Write a protein that binds this ligand. Sequence first.
Ligand SMILES: Nc1ncnc2c1ncn2[C@@H]1O[C@H](COP(=O)(O)OP(=O)(O)OP(=O)(O)O)[C@@H](O)[C@H]1O
Ligand SMILES: Nc1ncnc2c1ncn2[C@@H]1O[C@H](COP(=O)(O)OP(=O)(O)OP(=O)(O)O)[C@@H](O)[C@H]1O
Ligand SMILES: Nc1ncnc2c1ncn2[C@@H]1O[C@H](COP(=O)(O)OP(=O)(O)OP(=O)(O)O)[C@@H](O)[C@H]1O
Ligand SMILES: [K+]
Ligand SMILES: [K+]
Ligand SMILES: [K+]
Ligand SMILES: [Mg+2]
Ligand SMILES: [Mg+2]
Ligand SMILES: [Mg+2]
Lengths: 527, 527, 527
Amino acid sequence: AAKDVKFGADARALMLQGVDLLADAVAVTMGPKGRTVIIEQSWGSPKVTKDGVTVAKSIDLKDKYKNIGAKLIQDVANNTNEEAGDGTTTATVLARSIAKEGFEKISKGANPVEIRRGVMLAVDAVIAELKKQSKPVTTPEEIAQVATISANGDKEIGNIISDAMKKVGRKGVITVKDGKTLNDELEIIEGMKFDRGYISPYFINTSKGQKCEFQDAYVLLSEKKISSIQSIVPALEIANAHRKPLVIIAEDVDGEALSTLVLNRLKVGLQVVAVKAPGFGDNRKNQLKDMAIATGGAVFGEEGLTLNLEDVQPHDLGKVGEVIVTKDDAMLLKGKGDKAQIEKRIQEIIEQLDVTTSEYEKEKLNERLAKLSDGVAVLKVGGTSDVEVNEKKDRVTDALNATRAAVEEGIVLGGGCALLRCIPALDSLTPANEDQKIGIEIIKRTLKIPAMTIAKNAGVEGSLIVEKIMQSSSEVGYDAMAGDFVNMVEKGIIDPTKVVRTALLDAAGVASLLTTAEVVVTEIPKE
Amino acid sequence: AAKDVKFGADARALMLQGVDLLADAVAVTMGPKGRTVIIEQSWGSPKVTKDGVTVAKSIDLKDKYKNIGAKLIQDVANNTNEEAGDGTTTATVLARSIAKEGFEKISKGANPVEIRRGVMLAVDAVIAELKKQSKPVTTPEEIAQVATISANGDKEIGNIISDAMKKVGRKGVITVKDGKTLNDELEIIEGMKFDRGYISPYFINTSKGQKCEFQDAYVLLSEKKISSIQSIVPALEIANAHRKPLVIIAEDVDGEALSTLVLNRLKVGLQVVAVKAPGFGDNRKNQLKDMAIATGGAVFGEEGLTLNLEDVQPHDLGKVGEVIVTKDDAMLLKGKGDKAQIEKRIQEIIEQLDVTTSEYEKEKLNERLAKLSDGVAVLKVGGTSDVEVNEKKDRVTDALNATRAAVEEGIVLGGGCALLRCIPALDSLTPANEDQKIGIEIIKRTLKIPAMTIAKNAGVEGSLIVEKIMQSSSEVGYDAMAGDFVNMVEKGIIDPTKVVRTALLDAAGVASLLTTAEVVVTEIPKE
Amino acid sequence: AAKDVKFGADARALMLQGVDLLADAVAVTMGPKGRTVIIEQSWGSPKVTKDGVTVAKSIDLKDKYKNIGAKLIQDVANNTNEEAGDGTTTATVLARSIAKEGFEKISKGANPVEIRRGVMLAVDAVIAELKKQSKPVTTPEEIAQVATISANGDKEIGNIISDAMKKVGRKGVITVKDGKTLNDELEIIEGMKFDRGYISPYFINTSKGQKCEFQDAYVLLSEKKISSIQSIVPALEIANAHRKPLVIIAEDVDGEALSTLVLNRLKVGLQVVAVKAPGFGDNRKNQLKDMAIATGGAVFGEEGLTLNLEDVQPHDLGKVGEVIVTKDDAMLLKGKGDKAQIEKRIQEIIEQLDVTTSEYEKEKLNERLAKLSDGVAVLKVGGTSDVEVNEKKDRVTDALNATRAAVEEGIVLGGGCALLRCIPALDSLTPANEDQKIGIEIIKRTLKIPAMTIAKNAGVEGSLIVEKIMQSSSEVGYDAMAGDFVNMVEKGIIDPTKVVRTALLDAAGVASLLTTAEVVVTEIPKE
Ligand SMILES: Nc1ncnc2c1ncn2[C@@H]1O[C@H](COP(=O)(O)OP(=O)(O)OP(=O)(O)O)[C@@H](O)[C@H]1O
Ligand SMILES: Nc1ncnc2c1ncn2[C@@H]1O[C@H](COP(=O)(O)OP(=O)(O)OP(=O)(O)O)[C@@H](O)[C@H]1O
Ligand SMILES: Nc1ncnc2c1ncn2[C@@H]1O[C@H](COP(=O)(O)OP(=O)(O)OP(=O)(O)O)[C@@H](O)[C@H]1O
Ligand SMILES: [K+]
Ligand SMILES: [K+]
Ligand SMILES: [K+]
Ligand SMILES: [Mg+2]
Ligand SMILES: [Mg+2]
Ligand SMILES: [Mg+2]
């Protein structure tokens, strides 16, 4: 394949043109006053979206040289989306700013590698300052405010998320599905999440979602590994006799048993799924007992009152109404166990919580209580047509991800003012030479970009707004939706720290490497 | 694939051009004085229709940017057709008006999201007013008037529909079929409608209507799911040797059996279709044995006197005269079961009705007896050629859908006067800011469109007609066919409330979302 | 697929151009002085024809808009050909006239739907007048005149058809085959025709005609349905032993026996065909025993002196010289029954004719006598080459269809004067408004077209001929072949009523619907 080679400023200009095009397309959706982007779909209706990485991933350019910058910005946005789940537009605009400054600061005597090192040093200092200034979340009002801010100022989504996390706890399970009505509905379904996926992908019974879903499934628990075929055949016979699916939760399944299960499922049609038993040692036995009590079943392989898998009986297996299994996790939703046994187990765990003072035991008992009690939550998004339902689902997912991020770590000022207050942290750095000084100055100039973009999207002059923000007190910022300078914390314009630091880190790490190029090699287009 | 990105007013202008073209094509058919549209068919004679969604779905534009607006208006029309079954042209014209106003009201300082929120609020207020103004239907004359109005003023269609619903009840089953004479006639045929769609879309054997039509097909039943390939091979062999279609009524069809069926149908040509079994548990078995007696077949998989699917022999399966299957519902009309067993099960059901007094059991038994006794009504339309028969079928289907809608809910003034009287309901709203006020004004101006279009199609000026209507009393409207201001209720120009509110809701919900776009991304054309 | 949309007079002009082209091509063949059309055939010699439907079906235009009008006129011609079997050119010219008038009478204030309604009312009135003016056929001279007029003035064909219907009765069976000589021949073959097709397409033993032909076949009759395989296996054994084809005529054949017959015919090669038993109840038994005595066989399953099927013997099966069976009907020509039973049964049928006086029994006995006595008649068309043989066969088929139509219903004046005398019938109609009056006027102007076209093809001025005709008495018309005004009834220029009313109805029904169009949607041609 013949190739074309470009040298010097021409390649930089072409790649900067590509980066500018992609970032200008992306940045129109930033802020409370941003607008949407319509993307043509080949198989049906066009998709209307406000999500930054969704816009970034859908732009490919005919030119070979601009496509390089487009792909690099796409990489920035995708990394930011995967690591944090939010703040892709901020990463895109920061990447464009850093790339433009780096391209403009290249001369014959300049050393781009030392500029990259200085940029990395400044970014590390800013991240340290951000972590120092962070504060934790303690009240449900903060959760509601975070959810509302992340959902483009929709208060109903924030209230729904806050109520869901009240009902299922701060570490509960929340799932988003498309609805069939005009309003949003929240349903609380009992269940557990034991952080174990399926052993073999042959158990998948659907083509969409890549999950194994069974209804009214039998529960099979074994403390020890399943090796003998005769220890599992009667269970399969019982499951087939009742025409009900079977769920196998043991320590491990060897090759012979797994092959037999796969062959029976593919040929006969038995709905059998085997997963790894969660926990280790004592915790594994405790959690097996927990599911046995919850589903009304029993634990096989235990030393005390040992019950063998060979003489398995229908009454020795628990019943679960619905099972959902994926490659990362699996859930059993509604068991059929007696309430008395569940109450006894809960009381025993509560008593054991007050017996010993240790992090490990207390955390394990709290996890067991949460699994046995909280359950899962499902959110249904309503609307009239598919496009608006999809857009609302995107906003709800972004709000959920941002709320989880703000629960894991602390929160900072929103509206782009968090990065502005970290500029004085760059005054404590001592560059080793001129190039590190150039990099530090590039980062210092770049740190003002998010606030300027948010102000510009609102129809005002960003420079004056940023200058006024920097001259006010530490708690005063700009309210773009209202157009007034207000107390950010009191008005509830707050953002997670994780999203901000992740976006800054990814943008800097990719753009600084991009700005060190001298030669670009691309393939000649074919006919 | 390379993509093209457009910014600002260019994309909006192109999308508006596409929307204007599609809506101008659609709107010529609205009103009693509307005209028809000829759509070319690639496999035969051209199709002449007066139906709005049929015209809308058949317009695709070469330009990539106008096609987005075309697809969005097509989605509006399709949603209106699926939810209500009538009023697609009204939805199309309202959508065009809202889109044009929204595109005209976008400026640098405007916030389209708040405009959309205001539009939604105004639409909700108007819908509440419409629900308040509605009145129910009490006499068959109102039904005849509704059917006549919905059928483009054809009194014979209204009379025949009124007679049919008198004979089979207001909540019966009515079907439309091709006639072989010059006139329309009504016949009563016993049958059942079990309310289930088809498993796979590959079973469609027709080009028009998106349905599955077989004649003189056998019936296969299975209480349990069909999984093994060999459990279904003898039935397929029987269907092939007997050279007649086959119908499978199973709990579910897994991937292997479905793949075998679709490959056999595509390669050999067997007319086989599988649909989901209606009901659950005991009701499921009751309905399956319902249809077993109705067809004279047998129920497979039952615990008592179990009969396997592997040894199926033709007297173990029933026969039906004709099969109608669509994605939502399916029916089998003329079974071949003997009368004695049907009667004996009828008396056992009426006896079971007298055994227990409970809502669930009584409702299930009433549904079963209605299915086994009342039967369906078939309408046959007359004509000399296929084109006029198809046009009359479209009009009769629209009339039936509108009659059902006006039976479920109330009726309002026709001719577009229902929305005009709801304009004062918008004067009690207090917008939160300028943008919500702009949205409310957009909706207020849009509410006059249907009456103006109906008047314009009649060859007069719509503005003067609307102005004179708004200055008259509450019960006075414009008769487009006669050209006189008359009492709508006395003259019988009335519309269902459900159709009006559905059309308005879908039109607003899609057009307001469309009017918030800033960037359009389309794929570059290929060679 | 990209599509093109046209509005207003452009689409109407294009469709009118297409209609004018097709009708101008068709109309040159109308009348006694019409000319022929040569149509290219891709696989051999060109086809020379004078039939209107054949010419219409072979014109396809490159332009997408003219092709719509072409297809509509083709639909008119095909419907007229399928319904009456004659008068396709009249339908084509009437359709063109109505379409042209309707396109000319469209303005801003016009309502085409009311115009269509007025057209339908006018057509109904004209058809009622035509039915009033009809008179029946009573003499062979009228039949000869009808056949001669329909055969383009060929007296030999008329004489042959008159002789054939004299020999085999007015409700006899006449078939046309290719001849191998220079002259036309009529041959009389005894036989019976029971109006029943065969059960399964698998019995076809040829590629041309889609009919099953056996020679020197056995006859098996069963009063009841054949269910047991052992009740039929000896029949195939006897048929294979004598190496003769077998024809089975039973009430019905179940799936098992049909599959066995198909398998044996495909693998072994036995010439067996299954057909349905004609007649219902007593009539079925009477037909079965009549064909049994005609073929010298016996009827199995009769209650009195029951003869079983499992012990079937060669002498129990009738013998027939040859069998012709198709989808719609089947023929048994040369049975081997003894003359004594046939003559005897003739005597008892004649006796029971005079025993009771009832329309049902008298009709059944008359059909039984016709089947047992008349037989069939075959017409062989002679010529030197294939082209002129095909043209003569087309004319003979047209004459046969017209003669059958004139036997079923009455006759009216020919030469297009039948429609002229119905113009005053339109003066008694009172239109509801202006548009219905416009439609009535359109029909009134259209009614003069056939006479004008016939006169125009003769080389004279049609307007003067029509004006002179309307000023003469009721029985005076124009003789286009001789150029004189003569008494049409005396000279034998007469036409069937069915052909005229069918052509008028079809042409009006399609053209009036066509004239209401406003928008035309066509696909962009692909390179
Ligand atoms: N009312 C408001 N006034 C000022 N700033 C606001 C207001 N509401 C939100 N913001 C800020 O605007 C930003 C919201 O941007 P947005 O959610 O569109 O994009 P993002 O965080 O880069 O990621 P994504 O596109 O994936 O959602 C955040 O920095 C948030 O703090
Ligand atoms: N004689 C009449 N005078 C005034 N208004 C009328 C008259 N007849 C019908 N209308 C009104 O005109 C409208 C009829 O619309 P039309 O039948 O063209 O299509 P639609 O309801 O939008 O749906 P679709 O095309 O799917 O059938 C209704 O609002 C009806 O109330
Ligand atoms: N000698 C005649 N003088 C005047 N009119 C005649 C004479 N012979 C026949 N006609 C009339 O001319 C017409 C014959 O038309 P022609 O046979 O060309 O076609 P057609 O009946 O329209 O149908 P097709 O083309 O399918 O055979 C009839 O209306 C018939 O009454
Ligand atoms: K965004
Ligand atoms: K319409
Ligand atoms: K002709
Ligand atoms: Mg965000
Ligand atoms: Mg309608
Ligand atoms: Mg003729």
